[PDB]
Design a protein around this ligand. Structure first.
Ligand SMILES: O=C(O)[C@H]1[C@H]2CC[C@H](CC2)[C@@H]1Nc1nc(-c2c[nH]c3ncc(F)cc23)ncc1F
Length: 162
């Protein structure tokens, strides 16, 4: 239904209304983003990874991911975290004031966030948060360093891997 970061997104459930909101990045730039308000589920289909995303307003509730290799799974996770519009993803932006240009009639801020994190997702992964996980057979944790764990995971994130 739409393409974002190389994944085909389809909404499978729920609805949202869009409210324009100014947000402040970690490096103190202002982005004016269309915040989606409501409960939604999406599928994400890539060449090398597939995910199920459950989200609410600026909140990743669950992401289940399967993929070819560590790189392919990290790609899905980064796109999902930007799509979530979470405040910790907005605050993970650091470094050059790259969102200040204004040359184009309109420069999509969610695309700007994804392009930022495609350069380096270390700050994003390190600030997202980790949680203890239940023992669900075939579901493993993935740590900020993209290492598997049976005990902990990035908040809301599980890899489907036997
Ligand atoms: O807002 C936009 O300009 C585009 C770009 C940035 C993310 C989506 C894909 C590209 C967005 N397009 C669409 N988003 C959504 C959408 C629903 N809930 C969401 N929550 C967060 C989010 F972020 C986008 C959405 N629905 C239909 C779309 F067609």
């Amino acid at each position: 239904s739409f393409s974002f970061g190389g994944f085909t997104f389809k909404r499978t459930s729920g609805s949202s209304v869009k409210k324009e909101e100014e947000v402040l990045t970690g490096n103190l730039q202002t982005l004016k983003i269309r915040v989606h308000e409501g409960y939604e589920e999406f599928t994400m289909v890539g060449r090398r990874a597939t995910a199920i995303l459950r989200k609410a307003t600026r909140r990743l509730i669950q992401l289940i991911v399967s993929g070819r290799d560590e790189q392919s799974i990290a790609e899905a996770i980064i796109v999902a975290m930007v799509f979530s519009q979470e405040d910790c993803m907005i605050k993970a932006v650091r470094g050059d004031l790259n969102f200040v240009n204004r040359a184009n009639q309109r420069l999509n801020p969610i695309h700007q966030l994804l392009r930022h994190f495609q350069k380096d997702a270390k700050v994003l992964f390190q600030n997202w948060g980790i949680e203890s996980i239940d023992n669900v057979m075939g579901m493993i944790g993935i740590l900020p360093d993209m290492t598997p764990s049976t005990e902990m995971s990035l908040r809301g994130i599980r890899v489907s891997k036997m």
